[PDB]
Amino acid sequence: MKVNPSVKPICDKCRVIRRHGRVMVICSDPRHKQRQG
Amino acid sequence: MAKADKATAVADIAEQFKASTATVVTEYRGLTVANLAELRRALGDSATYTVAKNTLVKRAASEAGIEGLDELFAGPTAIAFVKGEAVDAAKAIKKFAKDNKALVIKGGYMDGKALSVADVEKIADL
Amino acid sequence: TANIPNKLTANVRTRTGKGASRQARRDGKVPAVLYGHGTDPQHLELNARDFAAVLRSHGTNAILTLDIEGTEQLALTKALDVHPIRRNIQHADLLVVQRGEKVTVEVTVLVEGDATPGTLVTQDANTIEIEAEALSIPEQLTVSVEGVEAGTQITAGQISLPEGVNLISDPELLVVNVVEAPSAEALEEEGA
Amino acid sequence: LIKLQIQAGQANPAPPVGPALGQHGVNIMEFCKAYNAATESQRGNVIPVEITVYEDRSFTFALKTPPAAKLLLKAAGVQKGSGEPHKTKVAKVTWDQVREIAETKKADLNANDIDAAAKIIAGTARSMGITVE
Amino acid sequence: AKRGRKKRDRKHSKANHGKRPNA
Amino acid sequence: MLIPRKVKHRKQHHPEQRGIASGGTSVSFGDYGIQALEHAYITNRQIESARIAINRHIKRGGKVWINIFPDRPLTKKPAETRMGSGKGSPEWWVANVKPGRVLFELSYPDEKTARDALTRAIHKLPIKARIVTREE
Amino acid sequence: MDVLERLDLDTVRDLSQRTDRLGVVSLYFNADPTQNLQVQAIDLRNRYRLLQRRMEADGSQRYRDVAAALERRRPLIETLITGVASGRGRIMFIGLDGDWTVHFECMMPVTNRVVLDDGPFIHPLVEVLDEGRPAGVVVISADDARLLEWRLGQLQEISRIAQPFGQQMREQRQAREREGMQRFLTQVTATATELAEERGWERIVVSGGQRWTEPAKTRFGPPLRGKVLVDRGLGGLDDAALTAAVSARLHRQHKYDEQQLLDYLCDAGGTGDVALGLSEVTAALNAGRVDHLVYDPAVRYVGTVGADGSLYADGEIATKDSRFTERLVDRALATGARISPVEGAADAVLKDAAGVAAVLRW
Amino acid sequence: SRIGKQPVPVPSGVDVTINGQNLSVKGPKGTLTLDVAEPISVSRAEDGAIVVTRPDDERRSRSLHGLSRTLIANLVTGVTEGYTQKMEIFGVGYRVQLKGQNLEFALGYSHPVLIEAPEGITFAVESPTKFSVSGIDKQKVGQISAVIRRLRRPDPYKGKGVRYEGEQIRRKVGKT
RNA sequence: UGCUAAGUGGAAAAGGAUGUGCAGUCGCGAAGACAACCAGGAGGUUGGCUUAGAAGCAGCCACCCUUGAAAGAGUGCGUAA
RNA sequence: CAGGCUGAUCUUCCCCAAGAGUCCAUAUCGACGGGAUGGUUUGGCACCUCGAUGUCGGCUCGUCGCAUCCUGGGGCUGGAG
């Protein structure tokens, strides 16, 4: 998990969603998983 | 495939329909381009083997008095127009049909009437 | 070229100034002026959304037909006042014209076609001047760069003009310049 | 199916054929002996081989016509094509030469006519900077 | 700089009308 | 880095930062441009850093124009000294930019790379800006 | 009739590709004044004499022409004995039929060698380059800061910066001086990092004193902090002692790195990631899989070369030569590998592998 | 929208009871109850099918419309067909035996780990390295399967642990 | 009469983002558009150069032709290739 | 000297991503440029105290913050153990 103020879809299979007030990027590649903070 | 492109394609099928002595319709799903090449080369002497959108073919089917074929345009569809002869074309399909088993005959149009799948088979035999 | 004039409704302003123009724009209107050989300017107001529609499709030098409280008038767009930031139309100068009259107009030139792959096309002059009939102004002018090789100057004298259109600007304007595409080493020495 | 290019005049080299089909459990010496026997009719043109193996590792190899890129290099006398086509052109080829390559590729192309097959070979000449006349 | 920021920002009240002494 | 050859007066007052731009608000040379939206002093180091970002992205082809020049100098007095005793010596050269001013320009055959290259340069400038074209 | 400077792997590759109609003779001269110089001179002359006599004891047209060429190019050797600059090791490549010669001198020691070959003999030059990699030297005091470079056993200055932040209770004065010193270290390390990125430095020797040596080491970034050597007595030394100290420090670090590499090779040998032994190394070099070649320069490898240029070890089935290490090095250079001649590899750690090993690319 | 505009067909042997907003369904293998969100009205068409509709096209009415239809559809599937899950185990020395109504796992620990069966579900074992979890409620079955799955931390090198029947895990290599 | 779900109201930047409301341009669509499922996605050829290797997919240049319903001198992942 | 305002300098983060990393910007480092927090360093001002607010280091006694050294719980890994 990467915690940065800016989250972006690194690859073509990343999706941006919104859980519990955060903005999150979820991918099948565990490296690309990241959240905003 | 804009409004004119769809209008262009329906004219060609109608144009390619009247110029053919007879026609047979088949479904082709599962055939590799290598398999499609062999069938086309075998049929390349007289017949032309093409596919198109079912809705767009039905509009081309309204140009000719063939209104009995509207039920043959469901599922994948390949229409094989025969430029000459009738025995040669059907037989070339049968030797292919009994080899790949992925191509089956939906029906055929002749003498102003739709011809049943079995009755199409008798053209090659006779 | 025969253009059917665009019909627009115009209202004569009752109050002018900077307090009255700001209020007019707040109601989706644009102040306008109608001078020409009538030699007595008329202060008009035009619909903002209807005026922008005419300019969007028929170009900046659009011929108009104003309904000034029941009187038909043929008018031509002469100039526009556009805000740098908000990108509005703050004003519009309108020139009266009549059929069979020659006017001096700047039209845009477009560059179509793909040249030699090792070239970069640079357009120097955006527009050129012509002298055409009032209702026969071309909407745009085109040039072709197809197979043009290396360093050539396409000049304003070689633009293909329709009939009844005469070039006003001198025939030595460098309109399109085709040159060799810069390399990576030529990029790093430009602007250092 | 491993696509492999071995020149006709080379027998049992290490780089091309050594590690190619060795790792797959295929015979390393039995392929060449059948291959060299068939490829000794040409002896001067590199011809690719398509090693098609079966269940018992029996390979039904097929021989192919030399590539259309090679057949244009010696048809013009230059060893290697241009690295910057459309700017430098290595040589020239007459349109009558192009039909000759299309003749020896007749069993390996898509086209049915001879004019269509001529255009196919002319496409490969464009990519390597050979002017076709 | 919490003390300085709070004291300057409290001049945006409706009763001060956007100004206070010592800003 | 861009530096004037000479200036008559070496120590000057600060440029004023009021109003919008009168001239230079339209794209004249290239096909795409960067239009400012805020007042700032664009230093000659941010221009070099912003036109190398464009160069890297487009690689070989295309041309780049810089429409603003760092003419006006700003001074800086020696460190850790009390106030008074003269005015500091000039240290950096800035360009007074007002909203509406067009800073950079670019010509490139395709649009997606051109708009990406100009975005790489807006992130090096201390202001907000937008990408504008030659069309109306 | 030219003198090389700034030797590196590309220059060595471009020089090894030369050729002459008759041949090239390569001379390595050991002019170290610690040993007696006249002894080395006589040794070199004797080596030439044996080479010439082995040419003259065959009885062929080619051999008589080669012997005549050798006899004609005699005085170039006495020119080498009294070379251009004040170097410890001198190297000269002389073309026989042509009239071209290449001269080189360096402070790294060499050993006398006279070799007749088709092209220049490169092997010892690669060893010298391996043992003489460049490095930076930074010296800090409370007043100034010297930046120097060490290359091939010679030290040359780069910069001499002064304190820009140098200017009542003693405690406040000491605090101000501390802050000034910290800013000085930051600036000096920034300058050193820029120079290291420019000139391709590999290691940095940092000296600050008994107080300012560790902060300077920690100021460097993570890219460089792992390659910074700490010494405290570099201040006040003259150029000779400074060069001696830096050379000793870098030699120790190089030997430590070689030991670490040997330990890695010994550990990884068995998983298929690296290849040990002459046979497997030659087989890997034939296909160009070698990413890092390690060999003991002292061992004399014997090998065989085929028609296609492929290298074959002993017992592999064809011209057999005794200077096989030159062919190994040439192939490694051709395939873009990295050559690390570890002096003493074939002694203990890689005794079973004869000292030759390779790090495969796959 | 698309999900919630279609009815829920009811087979013959199902007794569906609607009491205002509380909906109950009786089936051959159990009974289940669902409470529907207020803006959405549940009613039965004359062809024996349950339909859900919403009055307004608001942001919240659309969200709860497609939601509510699926829970009702899942409610009648769980009483006629039921729910089951197939699971497997990989590795050497890894085994399962069904003790009473609970489960015994040997996963390379220093102690066996049990999984008490909550009411409503039953466990079944075919092979020592193969079992299944079956029940009446879709969410209850899924929740207990998740607990069983995470008994061992994921292994990308040898793939030791519990999986699903069609699980296709991601793997890497640690060579030395 | 509307807006906010953040206790925003009752502090803050570059920048990140399928939060929501209003207004306005443009494209595709009953000739079946977007999503989902089934089947094709080919041949010259491993395009030319460079490189230890470079086969659509370090890098540079070009980006053609054919059978065709379509199939890019190839949008990603991956292998030393 | 301490307190107060400021935050050039200092400190702790962050935005874009040229590159290094055998391939691969984001495992790990991240250049040129840009935006901020803290009041811990050197300073700027001279607002309280010159009819007195005793100054460094150590001892004794503490109390608070988390921007966490150990112990405690996790995501990614160029994490086989």
Swiss-Prot record, chain B:
Alphabetical UniProt keywords: Ribonucleoprotein, Ribosomal protein, RNA-binding, rRNA-binding
Recorded GO MF terms: large ribosomal subunit rRNA binding; structural constituent of ribosome
Function field: Forms part of the ribosomal stalk, playing a central role in the interaction of the ribosome with GTP-bound translation factors.
GO-annotated biological processes: translation
The protein's name in its UniProt record: Large ribosomal subunit protein uL10
Subunit structure: Part of the ribosomal stalk of the 50S ribosomal subunit. The N-terminus interacts with L11 and the large rRNA to form the base of the stalk. The C-terminus forms an elongated spine to which L12 dimers bind in a sequential fashion forming a multimeric L10(L12)X complex.
This protein's encoding gene: rplJ
Included stretch of the parent chain: 1 to 126 of 175
Entry GO CC: large ribosomal subunit
Family: Belongs to the universal ribosomal protein uL10 family.
Swiss-Prot record, chain D:
Disulfide cysteine pairs (residue numbers): none
GO cellular component annotations of the record: cytosolic large ribosomal subunit
Gene3D superfamilies for the chain: Ribosomal protein L11, C-terminal domain, Ribosomal protein L11/L12, N-terminal domain
PTM comment text: One or more lysine residues are methylated.
Annotated InterPro entries: Ribosomal_uL11, Ribosomal_uL11_bac-typ, Ribosomal_uL11_C, Ribosomal_uL11_C_sf, Ribosomal_uL11_CS, Ribosomal_uL11_N, Ribosomal_uL11_N_sf
Cross-link (Isoglutamyl lysine isopeptide (Lys-Gln) (interchain with Q-Cter in protein Pup)) at residue(s): 92
GO molecular function ontology, one term from the record: large ribosomal subunit rRNA binding
Gene Ontology biological-process annotations: translation
Record keywords: Isopeptide bond, Methylation, Ribonucleoprotein, Ribosomal protein, RNA-binding, rRNA-binding, Ubl conjugation
Domain of life: Bacteria
Coiled coil: none
Summary of the function given for this chain in its UniProt record: Forms part of the ribosomal stalk which helps the ribosome interact with GTP-bound translation factors.
Family membership noted in the UniProt record: Belongs to the universal ribosomal protein uL11 family.
Subunit structure: Part of the ribosomal stalk of the 50S ribosomal subunit. Interacts with L10 and the large rRNA to form the base of the stalk. L10 forms an elongated spine to which L12 dimers bind in a sequential fashion forming a multimeric L10(L12)X complex.
Protein name according to UniProt: Large ribosomal subunit protein uL11
Swiss-Prot record, chain F:
Keyword presence, Methyltransferase: no
One of the record's GO cellular component terms: cytosolic large ribosomal subunit
GO biological process: translation
Residue spans of biased composition, Basic residues class: 1-13
Record has Lipid metabolism as a keyword: no
Disulfide bonds: none
Gene Ontology MF terms in the entry: rRNA binding; structural constituent of ribosome; tRNA binding
Superkingdom in the source lineage: Bacteria
Bilayer-crossing regions: none
InterPro entries, sorted: Ribosomal_uL16, Ribosomal_uL16_bact-type, Ribosomal_uL16_CS, Ribosomal_uL16_dom, Ribosomal_uL16_sf
Region (Disordered) location: 1-24
Record-stated family: Belongs to the universal ribosomal protein uL16 family.
Subunit structure: Part of the 50S ribosomal subunit.
Record's function text: Binds 23S rRNA and is also seen to make contacts with the A and possibly P site tRNAs.
NCBIfam families: rplP_bact (TIGR01164)
Entry protein name: Large ribosomal subunit protein uL16
UniProtKB/Swiss-Prot annotation, chain H:
Residue ranges crossing the lipid bilayer per the database entry: none
Top-level taxonomic group: Bacteria
This protein's record includes keyword rRNA-binding: yes
Molecular function GO labels: rRNA binding; structural constituent of ribosome
Keywords of the record: Ribonucleoprotein, Ribosomal protein, RNA-binding, rRNA-binding
GO annotation, cellular component aspect: cytosolic large ribosomal subunit
Any Gene Ontology biological process: cytoplasmic translation
Description of how the protein assembles with itself and partners: Part of the 50S ribosomal subunit.
PANTHER family: 60S/50S RIBOSOMAL PROTEIN L6/L9 (PTHR11655), LARGE RIBOSOMAL SUBUNIT PROTEIN UL6M (PTHR11655:SF14)
Entries under NCBIfam families matching the protein: L6_bact (TIGR03654)
Record protein name field: Large ribosomal subunit protein uL6
Organism: Mycolicibacterium smegmatis (strain ATCC 700084 / mc(2)155) (Mycobacterium smegmatis)
